[model samples]
Target: GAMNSSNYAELFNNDIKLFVDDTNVYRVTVHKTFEGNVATKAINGCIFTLNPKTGHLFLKIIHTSVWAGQKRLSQLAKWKTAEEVSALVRSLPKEEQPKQIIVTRKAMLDPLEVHMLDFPNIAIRPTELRLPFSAAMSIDKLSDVVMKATEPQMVLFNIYDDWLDRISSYTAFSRLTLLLRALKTNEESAKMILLSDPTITIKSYHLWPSFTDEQWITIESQMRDLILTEYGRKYNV
Candidate 1:
């Protein structure tokens, strides 16, 4: 039987006891289990809480559905990589062709949304991390990022499309994570200048040994394919 309204009120009304594990700092974890559906109850009480006393917060990570999808893709890519390695060995002139040592994927991020996730969560507070081109990111800057990061890729985008509100099935999060990793590795800064009509061109600036045109093309194609196949509606406008 479903919990009555009174039961729900009791569950949320109390200051739930949080268990603390002493490691480096005062770290505490709290979990609530519902008889039927904890997720359903959480959604019903969709209001997230932050400790106004200490400024501690939490973020929803690794959605169960998305994590399963990630694992499926990871397995598929692994088999394909193994096949390529076997073929390379047969074609190589060397006495013994070494197995493929590295395999990685390139993906694009929907820079428009992921960066500002924390802002709305902290708008009431006085302090927050300020990102460049705030407010869904300036159209010109997004275009600049797409153009400069890829090679001759048509990044079909509509700046007006509000995706953050409905990006549960989108690659915006993954793309942002990839971009953050790229910045950490190269220590490169991106160009930022407002442009007209949501268009600004980007060109690879690093003259040093940087990602080759082929690599960029592959990355761009993978991103394009995913967008066209999985999240076409977000870009249709």
Candidate 2:
């Protein structure tokens, strides 16, 4: 897929942003604690296929007008389903609904981005995070800090690395090392998020996941157990 770039033949190239370099993006398996009021670790990001003419990577990120046609069509699909949510959406005026309809429909029907929705921290900047707990604390300890000490607390963990890197063993080892280091560094119990392209293979370590069905389910189950058993609601241990 990377060789010819045929995947992007339909789209324009001018809109593509260098979200991060292949090298730097991959090294993020070892996240550095951001030095600022907001203590977020550098996250892995995705390389989006850009559209030069419209300048949009995520097609839905495009304007609402572009989606008017889709929204009008979705109304027919809504009537087909016996869902109240769909009914409510159908009630909205055609003009007023393109944006909402496009966003919702894209979320459901769009398999291309199905994994990304699971990993929300892919394109985050340092300032965007306002979660509690400092880099000094451990992930295991983060829940208490969030619940008791910090005013507002939300922990976001990301396995920031390149997807198409050549060294599979090296990449896996690097991400594994990073996870151990991060956990060792922070005693706080927090969420793990995986943010990267669809090509990445590691799942046992990433916070969120973007793997194939089998891989996604396996890691998701592990992550669920880690969260619920370890840091679900209140901190016990």
Candidate 3:
């Protein structure tokens, strides 16, 4: 029912690492992708509660160990099962009950980072991005120009102050406004991808994080904590 600091613990091997925290290790969570490049986008794990109060185990498993773009999922998935994890943590000695276990599972995102565009940009740069397409080209001819253009073209359509007063009256304005996003995200595939659509479809976990500026602060804070705690345990004797 209650746990002390002495029972908070950790265990590990080549494939998986487990760190138990909190004094009341009344809950157990087993997760892979618990750390670095070995796992990403999503964490794989399970959570269960030991109610020494109720003398029962309540469990739930979150299994994403073999999803797309992640290398560590299967690696950790193979290490344990939901039942096995509970059994493992349940075996942790705790309390006056001779057979007691202490565990702690707090879902923490790691210090995830992405730094690409390493090479020199042979094309556009900041000072050059504001260049506008000549109206002579017109919206009519614009599609062909983009479609037939070379492979690595990135177009940024800028809406100046004029759009606030100049372009809002027409009903077509909604479609035109939506057009900016089309320019923002161009798709790719074996042949060609549609320029637009809205059906529920699977998105890659790694790439689908729709982020807000402030949200990233919490995200970054969580990341630092996760990585620090992770390595803290890793290096600790």
Candidate 4:
């Protein structure tokens, strides 16, 4: 039999619990069975959490049948994130709408996903560890630090679209090399800067013997292939 309104309320009303974990992470717990779609039936139980400051969504499904589309739970949580924030913004009075929206994992939010936020004055800042120092610096000064750190590389210009939002310029430096065979072989390390709207500059200030032109080219090619395989179709990177 189809569940009545009261039964549905009983099942869903107290089913979702939001709380902070020991590591200060935000977690959403789905208790009991909940149907995501009519076709897939009910998902046993799941938890959705994020880095709080970074906005990277994580999911754990309590039950899986090997090949279940249960793998799409993260996508489901991402959409819910947007929907929940929009609801909160709407609930506030007009003047209060301009208040800062707490982006738990701002770097985890991609360009396409950020557009889903229909609020204003959203400040994207670094994590709390560097909060005081970073908060005090002007945008230009911040850019200057990165530029000076890898000066000889002459990384003049860089442009980053939405896909770059998945990582911070500092973190991307390491992740870029993590998968590159060329950089790994040479034990080379690099940092990237977004010099402008569509340009990206790379500098390997930490390499023992820095990359030569051919080596740099190899690294660039490897990075391009990695990005293409990981996010090309969806992000057009």
lDDT of 4 by residue, 1-237 (tens): 222233322212322211111111122344544565333333232222322223222322223332255356455554444444454446547754423332334443442136535543443222222111111111233234432442111121222212235555334333322433322232122223112213333333321223444554565665555445545544676
> Which predicted model would earn the best lDDT?
4
lDDT of 1 by residue, 1-237 (tens): 122233323222333211111111111134555665332111000001122112121111111232232334433332333332334334546432221111111110112112223323211111121211111121233324432432222122332123233442124333332333333222222211111113333333311122234543455354444434434444564
Displacement of residue 102 (Cα, Å) in model 1 is 5.8
lDDT at residue 4 of model 1 (Cα atoms)? 27
Q: Which 10-residue window in model 2 sums to the lowest lDDT? A: 18-27
Colliding pairs, model 1: 109-175, 148-202
Which pairs in model 3 have colliding backbones?
none
Ranking by lDDT: 4, 2, 3, 1
Worst 10 residues of 4 by lDDT: 17-26
What TM-score number comes out for model 2? 0.20
Q: Which stretches of candidate 1 lie over 4 Å from their true place?
A: 1-71, 99-237
Q: List where candidate 3 sits over 4 angstroms from the true fold.
A: 1-206
Compute each candidate's TM-score over C-alphas. Answer: 0.18, 0.20, 0.16, 0.24
Q: Model 2's lDDT to the true fold?
A: 0.29
The TM-score measured for candidate 4 stands at: 0.24
Best by TM-score: 4
Considering TM-score, which of the candidate structures 1 and 3 is the better prediction for this target? 1
